[PDB]
Design a protein around this ligand. Structure first.
Ligand code: R59
Ligand code: ZN
Ligand code: ZN
Ligand code: ZN
Length: 234
């Protein structure tokens, strides 16, 4: 499209799509959290005559709105979804996807952490991702576990046909110059995990953060700078 949508343009309950490349879209929703309102991104990837979804739209109502906007703008069925960590902006709405016939997936690490926290639990388990540096194919994407960062279970997703790297909540947009929610983070390991991403995907052309505006590979160095400033807080 043209301009990327912002919190001021999406009332809570609605969802926007944004085309990144041929067969690749982000989805954008908003939610209230501890008095503020935040935007949040996921991904959609064309999979033959079907669609692969990356992450929910942060809640049941938003995720029903996401399915309806996919039918309006694309018109192909969502058959599988992957959640990239255990927080509610990634798994909240999994029950809506399941009731609609979507097969929901996450690593065994994510499924366990979601159950402890009381969040919705994806049905299927992704094997082969428990060690830092592990990668597996999942149809038109590669899934990568870079090590602990924003959370101990965070995954990143690469679309090779389009050179699109989806960083999720391990990667910060440029406008964010201070750290956000770090309660579940590994601050000591986060920079090393970002370096694994840079070394595995040096050809990436578009980088999509979990919250806010897309950019390029500069977002990886940016995130390192912000994490190290938080580590050195007074
Ligand atoms: C609910 C999500 C689950 S990831 C969370 O708890 N925190 C997020 C959201 C966030 C915090 N500050 C911001 C400042 C600007 C934009 C987004 C944010 C994070 O830390 O990136
Ligand atoms: Zn999170
Ligand atoms: Zn998030
Ligand atoms: Zn920066």
């Amino acid at each position: 499209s043209g301009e990327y949508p912002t919190v001021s343009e999406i009332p809570v309950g609605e969802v926007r799509l944004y085309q990144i490349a041929d067969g690749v879209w982000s989805h954008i929703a908003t939610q209230s959290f501890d008095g503020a309102v935040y935007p949040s991104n996921g991904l959609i990837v064309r999979d033959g005559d079907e669609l692969l979804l990356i992450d929910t739209a942060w809640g049941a109502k938003n995720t029903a709105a996401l399915l309806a906007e996919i039918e309006k703008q694309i018109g192909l069925p969502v058959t599988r979804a992957v959640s990239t960590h255990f927080h509610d902006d990634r798994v909240g709405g999994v029950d809506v996807l399941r009731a609609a016939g979507v097969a929901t997936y996450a690593s065994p690490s994510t499924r366990r952490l979601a159950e402890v926290e009381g969040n919705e639990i994806p049905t299927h388990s992704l094997e082969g991702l428990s060690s830092s540096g592990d990668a597996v194919r999942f149809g038109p994407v590669e899934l990568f576990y870079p090590g602990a960062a924003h959370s101990t279970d965070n995954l990143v997703v690469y679309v090779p046909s389009a050179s699109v790297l989806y960083g999720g909540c391990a990667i910060y947009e440029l406008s964010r110059t201070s750290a956000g929610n770090v309660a579940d983070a590994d601050l000591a390991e986060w920079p090393t995990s970002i370096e694994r991403i840079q070394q595995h995907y040096p050809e990436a052309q578009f980088v999509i953060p979990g919250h806010g505006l897309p950019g390029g590979l500069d977002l990886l160095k940016h995130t390192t700078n912000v994490v190290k400033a938080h580590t050195n807080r007074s």
